[PDB]
Amino acid sequence: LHDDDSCQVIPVLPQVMMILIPGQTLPLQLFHPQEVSMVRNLIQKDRTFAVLAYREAQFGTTAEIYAYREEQDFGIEIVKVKAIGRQRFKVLELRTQSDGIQQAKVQILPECVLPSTMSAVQLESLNKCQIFPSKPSYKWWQKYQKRKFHCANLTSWPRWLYSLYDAETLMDRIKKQLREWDENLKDDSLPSNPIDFSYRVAACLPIDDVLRIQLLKIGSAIQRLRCELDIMNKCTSLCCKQCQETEITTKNEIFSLSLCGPMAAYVNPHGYVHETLTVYKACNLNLIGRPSTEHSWFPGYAWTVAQCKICASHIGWKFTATKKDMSPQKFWGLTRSALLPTIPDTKVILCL
Amino acid sequence: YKHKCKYCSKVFGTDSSLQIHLRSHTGERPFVCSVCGHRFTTKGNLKVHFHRH
Amino acid sequence: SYNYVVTAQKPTAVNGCVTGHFTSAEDLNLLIAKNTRLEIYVVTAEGLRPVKEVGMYGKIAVMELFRPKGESKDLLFILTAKYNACILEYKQSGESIDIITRAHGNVQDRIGRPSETGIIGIIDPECRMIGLRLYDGLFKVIPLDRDNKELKAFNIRLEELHVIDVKFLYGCQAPTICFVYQDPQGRHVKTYEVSLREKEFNKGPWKQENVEAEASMVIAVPEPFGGAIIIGQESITYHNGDKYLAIAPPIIKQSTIVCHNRVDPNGSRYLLGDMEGRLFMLLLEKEEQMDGTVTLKDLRVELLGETSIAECLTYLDNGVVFVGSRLGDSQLVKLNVDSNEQGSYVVAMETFTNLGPIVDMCVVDLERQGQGQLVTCSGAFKEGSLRIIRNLHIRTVPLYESPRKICYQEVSQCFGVLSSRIEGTTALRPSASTQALSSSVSSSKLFEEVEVHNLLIIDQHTFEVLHAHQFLQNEYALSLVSCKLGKDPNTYFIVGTAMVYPEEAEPKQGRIVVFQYSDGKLQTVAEKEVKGAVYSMVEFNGKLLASINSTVRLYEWTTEKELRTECNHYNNIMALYLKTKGDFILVGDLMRSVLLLAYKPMEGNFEEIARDFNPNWMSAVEILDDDNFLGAENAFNLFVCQKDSAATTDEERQHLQEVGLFHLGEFVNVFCHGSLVMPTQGSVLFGTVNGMIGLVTSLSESWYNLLLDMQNRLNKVIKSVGKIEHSFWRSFHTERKTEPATGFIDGDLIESFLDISRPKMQEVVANLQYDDKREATADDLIKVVEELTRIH
Ligand SMILES: O=C1CC[C@H](N2Cc3c(OCc4ccc(CN5CCOCC5)cc4)cccc3C2=O)C(=O)N1
Ligand SMILES: [Zn+2]
Ligand SMILES: [Zn+2]
Ligand SMILES: [Zn+2]
């Protein structure tokens, strides 16, 4: 754990093209000796390398290695490694060294911890009533807003405005729609810390890369929550990233076949990771070939390559059932790097 | 590394090990995209689709 | 920018009141805390006599008197919000009155989370320690031995991390603290013994689990009985070891008891004030036994009457009580043995005007003499009032409801005031809306406690509510503007509202209503439906600028007397604050995101000139000039940012550079260009929560460098109560940051030059340079501060 605003020279994997959220898992599979030996030396040190944010990178996140496996198959030493994002940063200098790896002089960004809005206006006679009995309803929230924000009569703004900037209220509003995408998770699963909660939803939403960078560069966690909730309410249609305007699927089609949410990271037979979003119905997709069960990420289902009808780029795979006693008998698995969250027309702009 | 299969892009340690696997790609469309599983007729066709990822 | 801030009116709200023998052992004193000020009165049989008023370089957070063994009179412990601890002694030598500092230190720990229930400061009854609850899971102990002049302290880990209230218990063998805490199981009461030698916690005498769900207050009972009284919302219980009593009087259920005070030094009588102004008496009915013991038989609560919404209560003598109020005026009240004709034992004696909380204001030239008068919306709920401040002469116009916004329409010789009243729903009391001379209700069809919003038409001479217009059901009035629009020669009242429904978080519908007061009623001259909350409106050269959620929109007044959208500008931040100067438009949200927009008159659209996003809670903002912009942010700070003078890259021109930082010590709610008077340029008044009115004027670079020098020099000859340094007090402060001040000059410290001794006046002008570059005679600087005392 580095100090805030401090500087570190952290190595970079030259074949890691990805926006890494703090707390998000990064799966790696290295063949080359310079990449392999670099992983081993981090294990006997800090396990911390840099995942840069794009080939000109301006920000990024440090990754800590928490898993390591070795396979010596077919005369080639396979090294698979799982990492987890940790600290955000801004790049100061990138310097390529002897082998393919490179060093990065880096300044650590601090996680902006802001107090409550009423931390400055609350009267001390009512300080004793700031702790409320925990939540056992939608009338409990009408009391939480009244009680927590009573001192708004001392400012120029009502209570219902401070709720839109209240961290605890925004997480619950995001929790509501997140549960519509997954019949499990429950009130737990997601962290209670707003900073940790914002970084989980940042890695959970099916958003493109330039939208993931904006969530990284958003300073406060309260702003990161409002922008995240803004994406879920406005960007209801997912279009093909290539041709921009071909609508593949909408927000109401998302569901969770795997218990790990409606969007888990899966690995293909050659090391490529695919943040696959499972939806019920899809549009403007051409099926390539016949179904196949080989290396299927969902046992009992057969995958078929699905491509965009207009631009002929890869969008995902259609999964059909190989058994009758399975529901759904059909669903679509759309990879993230192929979609583009779109605000359907009636100028709507994402708000912080 | 070298000794890479031209159809699926798997790397082997020895050119010997390459050949014993080379006849698992029996078919008209033996070239497979290591990213999505797309099969193609020629190596050049696989390259164009690969570099669109 | 180089700016100059001077206090035009000291804070008026009362956040603390303690009594004791501070001046002399015989004298009974009343010490009152007004944010950054401390008033000391001697309580006479007639009333109250002022003795000495001092100011501090901090926001007084805890103010308590105590007398350790072997001390002549009582000593004063004061802790600031910035964690400056100090023990103070009163000392008078004829007429020279000075508050000496017997000990001082900074108790701030680098770690620790600031507690939810606030800073708590308690003292052992026998004065052997000072207990502080600043951070969760910690308890700072300051040994009260006269070798601790730097106030060295130690911490003790607290396995209970959510403490509600804590107090020191009376009549205990060892120093015992008794507190109420909450955990997943519920709310409980637990006691700890403190060992100033083991520096840890020992097992307390007793504990009671499963106390009231919303138990909020701990009252320590003196040694005649000992123990503690725990007061929540539903119950008043007494505990001591294995002695238990509890009552649930239905008379204290309509509100919550939030303050207390002991009436007799034996703990037999207690005063309780609630959130709505009620005053109760908690009597501990004792039963005299035959073996010399006195047991506690029952608890009894009787309603005494109504006062101002009391933040702090303290009993003086001869049935006189001081009601310290933050929302409304503080008062001296007299209690009677028998109730009056309405069943109230409380009768008012004196009332001290409290300007806080100022939620809106406006400068008006009432008497046309070019003097300038400030008329503010002040108070909350039944304490709401208008205050007409002059050159200071304050007139009070009570409204008995909460006033929100104000604007002056000279043509009607009238004030337009937005207000809200708390209530088939019936009013709780006759208010300004219910007592208007004429009353209208709005019709549109375009779209427990409840808020009813009204536009009140208040006469500029008599200040009587000529008309009260009740807005729609579930309609929340947000903005108010008086202006002429386009070619219309009539001046109108414009109101921007929002449709708030407890089910929808963000507002999706709102209204912009055009009103006119011609005869004795308000006519609705057309309306316009918008798909959001109208947060702010400003007149923009015969046109109406408005905010709709994140949208800034310029409206035009047609010949059909209707509003037509001209151009929009969609922002990625919530357009909450809206201020204009010429064709420049300043936009800001609650999170200190500052956006400068320019209306291009030749293109009929908006252009984004500059931007600056620094996530922090902003409360108010204002345009100083076409380049510099002033605002208020957490915590009680001011800031200025400007368009970059280095006009090299298009990138750099779109970044606003921060040039001013300053810990004002107040929570600014409204900025207002104007002055109270007939060298420096600009005059911006601001009202605050504590009732303080301040000035913001800009200095030349020549003067700024001079007054900054005189600042560091006047800070070497001025004694500060508690030995707090101006540099520390005025430095930009939030829990994450500590940075010195820049671009701001404390006029209060500069004005203290005219009140220091001439031998010390020369001490600061020695080796000074004045660019009139000769040295600065002591007489050149009274001329500069005499002119700086004329802005206010
Ligand atoms: O749900 C899904 C959707 C589709 C996705 N798949 C399947 C797939 C392939 O699928 C044919 C195949 C699968 C497995 C093999 C086994 N080998 C391993 C390497 O050495 C030779 C032997 C060979 C060919 C081939 C290439 C890429 C992919 C790819 O991304 C996936 O993994 N799971
Ligand atoms: Zn496409
Ligand atoms: Zn192969
Ligand atoms: Zn492919």
Author numbering:
A (entry chain A): 72 to 125, 131 to 212, 220 to 429, 437 to 442
B (entry chain C): 380 to 432
C (entry chain B): 2 to 392, 710 to 741, 748 to 771, 784 to 1014, 1023 to 1116, 1121 to 1140
What does the published report state?
The design of highly selective low-molecular weight glues (MGs) that cause the degradation of a specific protein and exclude others is an area of significant interest in the drug discovery process. Both globular proteins and C2H2 zinc-finger based transcription factors that contain a beta-turn are known to form complexes in the presence of MGs known as immunomodulatory imide drugs (IMiDs) that bind to CRBN, leading to ubiquitination and proteosome-mediated degradation. MGs can recruit or degrade more than one target; for example, pomalidomide (POM) and CC-220 recruit and degrade transcription factor IKZF1 along with SALL4 and several other targets. SALL4 degradation is linked to developmental abnormalities and avoiding off-target degradation is desireable.
Structural analysis provides a rationale for understanding the reduced affinity of SALL4 for cereblon in the presence of CC-220, which engages both ZF1 and ZF2. Notable differences in these two structures include the location of ZF1 K389 and cereblon residue E377, which shift in the presence of CC-220. With respect to K389, the distal morpholine ring of CC-220 engages the side chain of K389, which is not engaged by pomalidomide because it lacks the phenyl ring and morpholine ring that are present in CC-220. The shift in the position of visible K389 Cδ in the CC-220 structure is 1.7 Å away from the IMiD-binding pocket toward F150. The X-ray density for CC-220 and the adjacent side chain of K389 are well-resolved, and the distance of the morpholine oxygen atom to Cδ of K389 is 3.4 Å. In the CRBN:CC-220:ZF1-2(379–432) complex, CRBN E377 is displaced relative to its position in the corresponding POM structure by 1.5 Å at Cβ as a result of a clash with the phenyl ring of CC-220. Since the E377 carboxylate interacts with the amino group of POM and does not interact with ZF2 directly, the difference in selectivity is likely due to subtle changes in the backbone atoms attached to E377 in the presence of CC-220, which impact nearby CRBN:ZF2 contacts. E377 is part of a beta hairpin that contains W380, which is part of the cereblon IMiD binding pocket; thus, the shift of E377 results in a shift in the location of the glue in the pocket which is expected to impact the interaction of SALL4 ZF2 with the cereblon:CC-220 surface relative to the corresponding interaction with the CRBN:POM surface. Overall, these changes, and likely others, result in a change in the proximity of the C-terminal and the N-terminal domains of cereblon by ~ 1.8 Å, measured using Cβ of both E377 and F150, which is proximal to ZF1, respectively. With respect to selectivity, the weaker potencies observed for the interactions of SALL4 ZFs in the CRBN:CC-220 complex are consistent with previous reports of weaker degradation induced by this molecule.
